[PDB]
């Protein structure tokens, strides 16, 4: 008359471990085409009815949100990679996947999950020692600062729509990172804005913040457009009297006041505009509309206004000009004002836009992308992002390893070499671990359209001869010295990615039961 479950689920046994692996591989398969500079883009439709297009593994997996209780481990560890390193999230899942793929036949042959995990833990320690030994401490040796960073961005942009126009965009990326604080380089300080029209090589670098110029209302444009040494004021409130959308009723205690209410509202806006004049601003920003009365008043006071500014831009303006945003106009002090070396209006995109330039207080910059289509501009942004990251990392962290799979193959070699002396079941696991390391140069070749079999075989022979920096060349289908070619990434990327991939591997493999409470 009694039961144990009443809708309570639990599943235990080796079959559950294999089931966990299969679900986790599915995540790998979603992300495997994103590896490499020629990685493919994935189309995700979100519940908000917006579509996301990206080959960024972090973007894809964060949006995927795999439900399976075990596969979610790959999501967590990828987020750890995204927080601790900032890159390599694609390679962490791929390496974790292949290690679990090899764990499956080991489980079938009767090898316990402990023995599999134990060998992996040893194999990682062996690999990490090699990765450190392979690391190079190099900065401007036989070069200079901009010379390295130029080569770094130029490499990132290879074989992109802006390949021939690299001479223009590479400078933007190098300048963008060098315009930041040299002690803490934060990608969030580099803004990217899309402006349709024009050719890609006509893109512009701005030290301050650009605006979208949202004005179409009759009577605008009749205000000064250029300032040499402006003071900048930002408000959180609107400066308009009668909008093209809104309205109001008139209610009075006396008939004579009927007309007064219309003029009283005029005074209320005027007095707010007057207190701005008392502050001594030259340019006045607002996230909310600024109307005709404000423009006519400000223009006659030699003040420029721009309203309806994106919330993200208003914060960045303050970060550019060194001032402080205020909601009211009565309580404003001159210490709330920023300063620029120039205010100007640009013709970028064959349409006028407002911008600040040469802000002495700036910690940020703005990159303006031009092009004949939004899809192309999106490709430029993605190319700039990767170029910015490699410039940032090359400037920030001098301890590097060769990319392009070169490190994975050198690690693979030393892992196989160790297996020559490792006896017993541990020999089987150290071999499988080394095998997993090869998936990276493999999927790099496959995603690039290369003959992966030929390239992998040549890479194995090259490293066997002591050519420890050779990897996958993506410009010519061959192998070559990725160190000499400046295909770098910080050593910590390979150390943390390999540690993280194994941690997820062992945590998933360690689970012999799933319990789910339903109702």
């Amino acid at each position: 008359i009694v039961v144990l479950k009443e809708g309570t689920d639990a599943s235990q046994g080796k079959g559950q471990i294999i089931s966990n692996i299969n679900a986790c591989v599915a995540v790998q398969e979603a992300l495997k085409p994103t590896l490499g500079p020629l990685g493919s883009d994935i189309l995700i439709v979100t519940s908000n009815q917006k579509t996301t297009i990206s080959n960024d593994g972090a973007t894809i997996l964060k949006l995927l949100d795999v439900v399976h209780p075990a596969a979610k481990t790959l999501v967590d560890i990828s987020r750890a990679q995204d927080a601790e390193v900032g890159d390599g999230t694609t390679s962490v899942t791929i390496l974790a996947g292949e290690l679990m793929k090899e764990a499956k036949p080991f489980l079938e042959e009767g090898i316990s999950s402990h023995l599999i995990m134990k060998g992996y833990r040893k194999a990682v320690s062996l690999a990490v020692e090699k990765i450190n030994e392979l690391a190079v401490d190099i900065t401007s040796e036989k070069s200079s600062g901009r010379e390295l960073l130029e080569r770094c961005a130029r490499t990132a942009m290879s074989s992109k729509l802006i390949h021939n126009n690299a001479d223009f965009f590479v400078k933007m990326c190098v300048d963008a990172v060098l315009s930041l604080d040299r002690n803490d380089l934060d990608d969030k300080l580099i803004g990217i804005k899309k402006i349709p029209g024009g050719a890609m090589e006509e893109s512009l670098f701005i030290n301050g913040v650009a605006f979208k110029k949202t004005f179409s209302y009759a009577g605008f444009e009749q205000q000064p457009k250029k300032f040499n040494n402006p003071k900048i004021l930002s408000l959180n409130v609107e400066l308009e009297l009668k909008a093209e959308k809104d309205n109001a009723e008139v209610r009075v205690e006396h008939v004579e006041d009927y007309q007064a209410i219309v003029d009283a509202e005029w005074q209320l806006i005027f007095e707010k505009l007057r207190q701005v004049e008392e502050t001594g601003a030259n340019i006045v920003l607002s996230k909310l509309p600024i109307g005709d009365l404000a423009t006519q008043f400000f223009a006659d006071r030699n003040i420029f206004c721009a309203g309806r500014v994106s919330a993200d831009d208003m914060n960045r303006v303050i970060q550019a000009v060194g001032g402080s945003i205020q909601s009211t106009t009565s309580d404003i002090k001159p210490e709330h004002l920023g300063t620029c070396a120039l205010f100007e209006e640009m013709q970028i995109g064959s349409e006028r836009y407002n911008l600040f330039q040469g802000c002495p207080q700036a910690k940020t910059c703005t990159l303006l992308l031009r092009g004949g289509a939004e899809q192309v501009i999106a490709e430029v942004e993605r190319s700039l992002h990767d170029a910015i990251m490699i410039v940032k990392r090359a400037l920030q962290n001098k301890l590097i390893v060769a990319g392009g799979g070169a490190t994975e193959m050198e690690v693979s070699k030393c892992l196989r070499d160790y297996s020559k002396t490792i006896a017993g079941k541990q020999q089987m696991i150290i071999n499988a671990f080394a095998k997993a390391l090869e998936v990276i140069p493999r999927q790099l070749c496959e995603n690039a359209g290369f003959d992966a079999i030929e390239i992998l075989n040549k890479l194995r022979l090259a490293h066997s001869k002591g050519e420890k920096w050779y990897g996958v060349v993506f410009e010519t289908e061959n192998i070559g010295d990725n160190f000499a070619k400046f295909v770098w990434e910080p050593a910590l990327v390979k150390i943390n990615a390999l540690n993280s991939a194994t941690e997820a591997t062992n945590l998933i493999l360690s689970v012999d039961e799933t319990i789910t409470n339903k109702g």
Binding site: D41, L43, I44, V45, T46, S47, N48, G372, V376
Partner: protein
């Protein structure tokens, strides 16, 4: 500023004639901005198709397949103009390519307008250069936009 005043015996007549001005305004807009023009009627696609086809044989490598394919894709435009006109697209395209090889590369159009003959030089069917340039480049970029998609995941709609 000017306002284009459109009249007509019904709503759909005014709406279509008014929108017709939009298209014509775009044409004259582009002609003012960029004086360079090419002849239309599919003649440009045939000339470009022939050039790509002749160059394809010079590749001697794998790319030859894509270069020939690209040219064949261009052919679909003058063939579509034939089919939508009630013309044989095979006889039409054969004539278009033959005239531009046997006589002169000069643009040879199609009979889609019901005129006495082709050879748009005397017929005044002209497209702006920037228009045809963007048409080819943007269509190619879009093809790449789709070809590079190896995985699509679709959720619900809230």
């Amino acid at each position: 500023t000017v306002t284009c005043f459109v009249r007509g015996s019904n709503k759909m007549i005014v709406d279509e004639a008014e929108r017709a001005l939009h298209d014509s305004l775009c044409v004259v807009r582009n002609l003012v901005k960029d004086s360079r023009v090419v002849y239309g009627g599919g003649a440009a696609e045939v000339t470009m198709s022939l050039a790509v086809s002749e160059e394809a044989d010079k590749q001697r490598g794998i790319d030859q397949y894509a270069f020939r394919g690209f040219a064949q894709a261009l052919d679909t435009i003058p063939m579509t103009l034939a089919e939508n006109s009630g013309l044989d697209p095979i006889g039409t395209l054969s004539t278009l390519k033959s005239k531009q090889l046997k006589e002169k590369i000069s643009n040879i159009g199609v009979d889609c307008l019901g005129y006495g003959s082709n050879d748009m030089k005397e017929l005044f069917v002209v497209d702006p250069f920037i228009g045809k340039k963007q048409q080819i480049l943007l269509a190619t970029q879009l093809c790449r936009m789709i070809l590079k998609i190896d995985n699509v995941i679709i959720s619900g709609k809230d």
